[PDB]
Q: What sequence folds into this?
């Protein structure tokens, strides 16, 4: 049986090769998560087909409908066998799918254009001339919506009502907005994407300060999957043999431009 | 039923309260893991008894007998329901028991007596007047035993044959040895204990340089145990509510003496 592995387009995790229309199946993708999926499949000893999540979403549960969407929905409801992506391990998700141990560690962080006079979340919260916001959905925005920490409530209260809306739909847009705002827009995103962008050629962005929390990305399987054990053990093996670190360096630093 | 929670005496995770003989049950211990276990029990609504592992070991498979010892042994042989302790998540353990997502993050690190002329693993490897070693058994030792990185092969090559033995039976042993060797002994231990010792007293040791790798502690349960799922959820919950951060500050830094 060919395992259906669901993923999502996000640099440098999963990307279309330049000639992808002249290629087929797995070959048309490249990235960190493409290499991981391959490694995982090797050690789990399985055939797999990569497939892009139909609705292009990570996974959230509808307030009223209460149905899960995205990659999480595809795992829960029988569309896919495993998800390999920058899917943040969170309580709400783990309640309905299983996550392997983290294959990558991360935290919420601040991206600014070099020269911007802010150096921490407090600096942002005590001012207004510099706008800031998160992705329009995902674990980062949820982190802010739920926080009861003084500076983060305040940042949430501000973000909610700010318009022009501070929320953007993609990482590409948050970044493009940082670069084009002449130091008037920050951008809160996962430290991993921050570090990636840092090495991208205009070299005019930078992470500032420390992370706001400590998370990880995990490989996901439907709860009770006969694959869950093998997948988790493969991730650990790949970690201990240092291959996860080599893939991070390859996609983040060897290919960096700054 | 009452749940047996196996654990081990290791500061500041599990320690005896000064007047422990005048107290009974779980009340006679304090520390980070005692707090963690309390929290996990409240949310995974269960009664529990803290049980200090009989052999005072963490968990390794005897080469000839092939029997698992220590906390891992408790779980494998069905004598404990869950293990809460500075138990490193590793592939060899995960083959036989289950781990939660990491409740703490760590790396292998160096501990010197202040004023010792070394600052990296390399500095250690390229010299001989300063002796160094690891705990007599555990994940750390294994990291060196299996490393294929030249500098670590070399350090391991040396630690194998050095005499007197450079391996210590306990953390306290390694620390007493560092303090009493006047600069001639350096201790390769987990960054977490290193950081605790440095804030402890007298105030004569420090962590130096970066970590040689990156791992975490997990709460463990018997492989395929119904309890596993809810325990892992409790850990994610405590991570998100920020209680793991609080607890770490409580036992490492709020009490700092240096
Ligand atoms: C790219 C997106 C929308 C994802 C990636 N990880 C997070 C998640 O798994 O929710 C989201 C980013 C964020 O929330 O900052
Ligand atoms: C304290 C001891 C012997 C433990 C703690 N975690 C590691 C483990 O779980 O094996 C060991 C330390 C180490 O290996 O440096
Ligand atoms: Zn491989
Ligand atoms: Zn608007
Ligand atoms: Zn609680
Ligand atoms: Zn000897």
A:
């Amino acid at each position: 049986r060919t395992i259906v592995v669901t993923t999502i387009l996000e640099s440098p995790y999963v990307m279309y090769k330049k000639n992808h229309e002249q290629l087929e199946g797995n070959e048309r993708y490249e990235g960190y998560c493409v290499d991981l999926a391959y490694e995982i499949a090797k050690h789990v000893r399985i055939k797999y087909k990569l497939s892009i999540v139909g609705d292009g979403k990570y996974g959230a549960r509808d307030p009223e409908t209460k149905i899960w969407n995205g990659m999480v929905g595809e795992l829960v409801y029988g569309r896919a066998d495993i998800a390999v992506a920058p899917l943040t391990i969170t309580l709400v998700r783990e309640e309905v799918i299983d996550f392997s141990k983290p294959f990558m560690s991360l935290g919420i962080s601040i991206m600014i254009k070099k020269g911007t006079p802010i150096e921490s979340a407090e600096d942002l919260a005590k001012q207004t001339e510099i706008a800031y916001g998160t992705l329009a959905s995902g674990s980062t925005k949820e982190f802010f919506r739920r926080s009861k920490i003084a500076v983060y409530e305040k940042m949430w209260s501000y973000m909610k009502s700010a318009e022009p809306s501070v929320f953007t739909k993609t990482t590409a847009d948050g970044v493009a907005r940082v670069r084009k705002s002449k130091g008037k827009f920050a951008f809160l995103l996962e430290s991993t994407m921050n570090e990636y962008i840092e090495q991208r050629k205009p070299c005019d962005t930078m992470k500032v300060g420390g992370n706001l929390d400590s998370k990880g990305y995990g490989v996901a399987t439907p709860k009770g999957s006969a694959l869950g054990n093998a997948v988790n053990l493969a991730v650990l093996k790949l970690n201990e043999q240092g291959l996860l670190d080599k893939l991070k360096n390859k996609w983040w630093y060897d290919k960096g431009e700054c």
